Protein backbone atom coordinates (compact mmCIF):
# COMPACT_ATOMS: atom_id res chain seq x y z
CA UNK A 1 0.00 0.00 0.00
CA UNK A 2 1.72 3.11 -1.40
CA UNK A 3 0.98 6.83 -1.65
CA UNK A 4 -1.95 7.55 -3.97
CA UNK A 5 -1.11 9.39 -7.16
CA UNK A 6 -2.42 12.97 -7.26
CA UNK A 7 -3.04 12.90 -10.98
CA UNK A 8 -5.62 10.15 -10.48
CA UNK A 9 -7.93 12.09 -8.10
CA UNK A 10 -10.82 14.45 -9.07
CA UNK A 11 -13.11 16.57 -6.94
CA UNK A 12 -16.30 14.70 -6.18
CA UNK A 13 -14.64 11.30 -6.07
CA UNK A 14 -16.19 9.11 -3.40
CA UNK A 15 -14.14 7.01 -1.02
CA UNK A 16 -14.97 3.32 -0.59
CA UNK A 17 -17.37 2.85 2.27
CA UNK A 18 -15.97 1.13 5.31
CA UNK A 19 -17.85 -0.26 8.29
CA UNK A 20 -16.11 -0.83 11.58
CA UNK A 21 -17.41 -2.97 14.45
CA UNK A 22 -17.01 -1.83 18.10
CA UNK A 23 -17.78 -3.76 21.23
CA UNK A 24 -17.59 -2.94 24.92
CA UNK A 25 -14.20 -4.66 25.04
CA UNK A 26 -12.91 -2.08 22.55
CA UNK A 27 -14.15 0.65 24.85
CA UNK A 28 -12.47 -0.96 27.87
CA UNK A 29 -9.22 -1.41 25.95
CA UNK A 30 -9.26 2.20 24.75
CA UNK A 31 -9.86 3.55 28.26
CA UNK A 32 -6.61 2.06 29.57
CA UNK A 33 -4.61 2.70 26.39
CA UNK A 34 -5.58 6.39 26.29
CA UNK A 35 -5.76 7.09 30.01
CA UNK A 36 -9.36 8.37 29.78
CA UNK A 37 -10.96 6.24 32.47
CA UNK A 38 -14.26 8.18 32.64
CA UNK A 39 -16.86 5.55 33.65
CA UNK A 40 -19.51 6.75 31.17
CA UNK A 41 -17.59 4.69 28.62
CA UNK A 42 -17.77 1.42 30.56
CA UNK A 43 -20.39 1.47 33.39
CA UNK A 44 -24.03 1.50 32.23
CA UNK A 45 -25.34 2.79 35.59
CA UNK A 46 -23.15 5.90 35.40
CA UNK A 47 -24.48 6.44 31.90
CA UNK A 48 -28.00 6.54 33.40
CA UNK A 49 -27.22 9.22 36.03
CA UNK A 50 -26.29 11.63 33.21
CA UNK A 51 -29.19 10.63 30.94
CA UNK A 52 -27.84 8.06 28.48
CA UNK A 53 -29.20 4.68 27.54
CA UNK A 54 -25.81 2.90 27.75
CA UNK A 55 -22.07 3.46 27.88
CA UNK A 56 -20.73 5.35 24.88
CA UNK A 57 -17.58 5.24 22.81
CA UNK A 58 -14.94 7.84 23.55
CA UNK A 59 -15.05 10.71 21.11
CA UNK A 60 -11.33 10.37 20.54
CA UNK A 61 -11.77 6.65 19.87
CA UNK A 62 -14.20 7.34 17.07
CA UNK A 63 -11.93 10.10 15.76
CA UNK A 64 -8.98 7.71 15.98
CA UNK A 65 -10.87 5.19 13.86
CA UNK A 66 -11.47 7.91 11.31
CA UNK A 67 -7.71 8.38 11.21
CA UNK A 68 -7.27 4.74 10.30
CA UNK A 69 -9.96 5.12 7.64
CA UNK A 70 -8.35 8.14 6.04
CA UNK A 71 -4.88 6.63 6.06
CA UNK A 72 -5.87 3.50 4.13
CA UNK A 73 -7.35 5.56 1.28
CA UNK A 74 -4.38 7.97 1.20
CA UNK A 75 -1.82 5.17 1.34
CA UNK A 76 0.65 6.83 3.74
CA UNK A 77 0.05 8.10 7.31
CA UNK A 78 3.00 10.47 6.88
CA UNK A 79 1.26 12.29 4.04
CA UNK A 80 -1.67 13.57 6.09
CA UNK A 81 -1.44 17.28 6.92
CA UNK A 82 -4.68 17.88 8.86
CA UNK A 83 -7.60 16.03 10.47
CA UNK A 84 -10.39 18.10 12.09
CA UNK A 85 -13.62 16.79 13.71
CA UNK A 86 -16.64 18.31 15.51
CA UNK A 87 -18.44 15.83 17.83
CA UNK A 88 -22.21 16.17 17.36
CA UNK A 89 -23.63 12.76 18.45
CA UNK A 90 -22.92 10.03 21.01
CA UNK A 91 -22.12 6.48 19.96
CA UNK A 92 -23.88 3.95 22.21
CA UNK A 93 -22.02 0.68 22.56
CA UNK A 94 -24.32 -1.90 24.17
CA UNK A 95 -22.78 -4.71 26.20
CA UNK A 96 -24.94 -7.22 24.31
CA UNK A 97 -22.29 -9.48 22.67
CA UNK A 98 -22.48 -7.62 19.33
CA UNK A 99 -22.10 -3.92 20.19
CA UNK A 100 -22.38 -1.14 17.67
CA UNK A 101 -21.26 -0.40 14.13
CA UNK A 102 -19.83 2.84 12.76
CA UNK A 103 -20.01 3.42 9.00
CA UNK A 104 -17.50 5.88 7.51
CA UNK A 105 -17.86 7.73 4.20
CA UNK A 106 -16.08 10.54 2.43
CA UNK A 107 -16.08 12.80 -0.62
CA UNK A 108 -13.28 14.84 -2.10
CA UNK A 109 -14.17 18.45 -1.32
CA UNK A 110 -11.16 20.40 -2.65
CA UNK A 111 -7.81 20.01 -4.33
CA UNK A 112 -4.96 22.51 -4.74
CA UNK A 113 -2.54 21.57 -7.57
CA UNK A 114 0.27 23.87 -6.39
CA UNK A 115 0.83 21.81 -3.22
CA UNK A 116 -0.60 18.52 -4.55
CA UNK A 117 -2.95 18.60 -1.54
CA UNK A 118 -6.41 17.08 -1.38
CA UNK A 119 -9.07 17.79 1.25
CA UNK A 120 -11.74 15.20 2.03
CA UNK A 121 -14.91 15.93 3.98
CA UNK A 122 -15.97 12.88 5.92
CA UNK A 123 -19.18 11.57 7.39
CA UNK A 124 -19.60 8.87 10.00
CA UNK A 125 -22.95 7.52 11.12
CA UNK A 126 -24.30 5.03 13.67
CA UNK A 127 -27.82 3.65 13.30
CA UNK A 128 -28.23 6.25 10.58
CA UNK A 129 -27.46 9.27 12.78
CA UNK A 130 -24.34 11.41 12.11
CA UNK A 131 -21.73 11.52 14.85
CA UNK A 132 -19.61 14.27 13.33
CA UNK A 133 -20.29 17.84 12.26
CA UNK A 134 -17.43 19.47 10.36
CA UNK A 135 -15.08 16.59 9.58
CA UNK A 136 -12.20 17.03 7.12
CA UNK A 137 -8.73 15.60 6.44
CA UNK A 138 -6.01 16.79 4.06
CA UNK A 139 -2.90 15.15 2.62
CA UNK A 140 -0.09 15.77 0.11
CA UNK A 141 -0.18 13.12 -2.62
CA UNK A 142 2.57 11.75 -4.92
Amino acid sequence: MALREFSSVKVGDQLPEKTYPLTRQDLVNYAGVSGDLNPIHWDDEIAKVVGLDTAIAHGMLTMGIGGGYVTSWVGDPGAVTEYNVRFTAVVPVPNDGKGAELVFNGRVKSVDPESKSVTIALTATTGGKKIFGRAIASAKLA
Partner: protein, 137 residues
Protein backbone atom coordinates in the same frame (compact mmCIF):
# COMPACT_ATOMS: atom_id res chain seq x y z
CA UNK B 1 -14.67 31.57 34.01
CA UNK B 2 -13.75 31.88 37.73
CA UNK B 3 -10.14 32.79 36.82
CA UNK B 4 -9.20 34.82 33.76
CA UNK B 5 -6.85 32.57 31.79
CA UNK B 6 -6.72 34.39 28.42
CA UNK B 7 -3.36 34.18 26.68
CA UNK B 8 -1.67 31.99 29.26
CA UNK B 9 1.22 29.92 27.85
CA UNK B 10 1.85 26.70 29.78
CA UNK B 11 5.16 24.99 29.03
CA UNK B 12 5.12 21.31 29.98
CA UNK B 13 8.17 20.72 32.23
CA UNK B 14 8.83 17.22 30.81
CA UNK B 15 9.54 15.76 27.41
CA UNK B 16 7.53 12.94 25.81
CA UNK B 17 9.01 9.97 23.93
CA UNK B 18 6.77 8.57 21.22
CA UNK B 19 7.09 4.91 22.17
CA UNK B 20 7.22 2.14 19.56
CA UNK B 21 5.23 -0.63 21.28
CA UNK B 22 2.78 1.87 22.71
CA UNK B 23 2.09 3.30 19.23
CA UNK B 24 1.42 -0.17 17.83
CA UNK B 25 -1.05 -0.89 20.66
CA UNK B 26 -2.70 2.51 20.13
CA UNK B 27 -2.92 1.76 16.40
CA UNK B 28 -4.62 -1.59 16.98
CA UNK B 29 -6.78 0.07 19.63
CA UNK B 30 -8.26 2.41 16.99
CA UNK B 31 -8.40 -0.27 14.27
CA UNK B 32 -5.75 1.12 11.95
CA UNK B 33 -4.44 -1.52 9.55
CA UNK B 34 -1.85 0.30 7.42
CA UNK B 35 1.48 -1.58 7.66
CA UNK B 36 3.40 1.68 8.23
CA UNK B 37 1.80 1.78 11.68
CA UNK B 38 3.39 -1.60 12.57
CA UNK B 39 6.47 -2.44 10.42
CA UNK B 40 9.79 -0.62 9.99
CA UNK B 41 10.11 -2.12 6.49
CA UNK B 42 6.69 -0.75 5.47
CA UNK B 43 7.55 2.68 6.90
CA UNK B 44 10.93 2.56 5.15
CA UNK B 45 9.12 1.84 1.87
CA UNK B 46 7.36 5.19 2.33
CA UNK B 47 10.58 7.00 3.30
CA UNK B 48 10.48 6.95 7.12
CA UNK B 49 13.30 5.60 9.30
CA UNK B 50 10.92 4.72 12.18
CA UNK B 51 7.25 3.76 12.31
CA UNK B 52 4.53 6.36 11.95
CA UNK B 53 2.45 7.01 15.04
CA UNK B 54 -1.35 6.80 14.86
CA UNK B 55 -2.57 10.20 13.78
CA UNK B 56 -4.44 10.79 17.05
CA UNK B 57 -1.61 9.46 19.28
CA UNK B 58 -0.49 12.84 20.63
CA UNK B 59 -3.84 13.18 22.37
CA UNK B 60 -1.94 11.53 25.24
CA UNK B 61 0.65 14.30 25.31
CA UNK B 62 -2.03 16.99 24.84
CA UNK B 63 -3.89 15.85 27.97
CA UNK B 64 -0.75 15.36 30.04
CA UNK B 65 -0.33 19.12 29.58
CA UNK B 66 -3.99 20.09 29.94
CA UNK B 67 -4.33 18.29 33.28
CA UNK B 68 -1.04 19.73 34.54
CA UNK B 69 -2.51 23.17 33.74
CA UNK B 70 -5.88 22.65 35.45
CA UNK B 71 -4.07 21.21 38.49
CA UNK B 72 -2.13 24.49 38.76
CA UNK B 73 -4.86 27.08 37.91
CA UNK B 74 -8.33 27.00 39.46
CA UNK B 75 -11.31 27.41 37.10
CA UNK B 76 -13.91 24.87 38.29
CA UNK B 77 -16.54 19.10 30.73
CA UNK B 78 -17.21 17.82 27.21
CA UNK B 79 -14.80 18.08 24.28
CA UNK B 80 -16.67 19.45 21.26
CA UNK B 81 -13.94 19.81 18.62
CA UNK B 82 -10.54 18.32 17.81
CA UNK B 83 -7.99 19.49 15.21
CA UNK B 84 -4.50 18.24 14.30
CA UNK B 85 -1.94 19.99 12.07
CA UNK B 86 1.04 17.87 11.07
CA UNK B 87 3.98 20.05 10.07
CA UNK B 88 6.26 17.02 10.27
CA UNK B 89 5.37 13.34 10.56
CA UNK B 90 5.58 12.13 14.15
CA UNK B 91 7.46 8.84 14.39
CA UNK B 92 8.31 6.27 17.00
CA UNK B 93 11.37 7.40 18.88
CA UNK B 94 10.57 11.10 18.50
CA UNK B 95 11.23 13.33 21.51
CA UNK B 96 8.54 15.99 21.83
CA UNK B 97 8.18 19.14 23.94
CA UNK B 98 4.67 20.34 24.64
CA UNK B 99 3.39 23.87 25.10
CA UNK B 100 -0.28 24.71 25.62
CA UNK B 101 -1.63 28.18 24.86
CA UNK B 102 -5.09 29.45 25.74
CA UNK B 103 -6.35 30.24 22.25
CA UNK B 104 -9.83 31.54 23.14
CA UNK B 105 -12.18 31.92 26.09
CA UNK B 106 -15.92 32.51 25.68
CA UNK B 107 -19.20 31.96 27.48
CA UNK B 108 -21.89 31.71 24.80
CA UNK B 109 -25.47 30.73 25.80
CA UNK B 110 -25.01 29.14 29.21
CA UNK B 111 -21.48 28.09 30.11
CA UNK B 112 -17.82 28.55 29.19
CA UNK B 113 -15.89 27.79 25.96
CA UNK B 114 -12.11 27.35 26.13
CA UNK B 115 -9.97 26.53 23.09
CA UNK B 116 -6.59 25.09 24.00
CA UNK B 117 -3.76 24.98 21.44
CA UNK B 118 -1.16 22.31 22.14
CA UNK B 119 2.14 23.04 20.41
CA UNK B 120 4.60 20.18 19.88
CA UNK B 121 8.26 20.80 19.06
CA UNK B 122 11.20 18.39 18.89
CA UNK B 123 14.73 18.47 20.32
CA UNK B 124 15.88 20.90 17.62
CA UNK B 125 13.08 23.37 18.39
CA UNK B 126 11.30 22.89 15.06
CA UNK B 127 7.51 22.63 15.03
CA UNK B 128 6.19 19.15 14.37
CA UNK B 129 2.52 19.48 15.32
CA UNK B 130 -0.23 21.72 16.64
CA UNK B 131 -3.41 20.39 18.26
CA UNK B 132 -6.50 22.49 18.97
CA UNK B 133 -9.02 21.23 21.50
CA UNK B 134 -12.33 22.96 22.20
CA UNK B 135 -13.73 22.32 25.68
CA UNK B 136 -17.17 23.32 26.95
CA UNK B 137 -18.71 23.99 30.36
Amino acid sequence: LKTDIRGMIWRYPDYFIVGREQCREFARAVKCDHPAFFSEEAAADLGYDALVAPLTFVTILAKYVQLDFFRHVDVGIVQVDQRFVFHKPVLAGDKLWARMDIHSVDERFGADIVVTRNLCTNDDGELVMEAYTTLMG
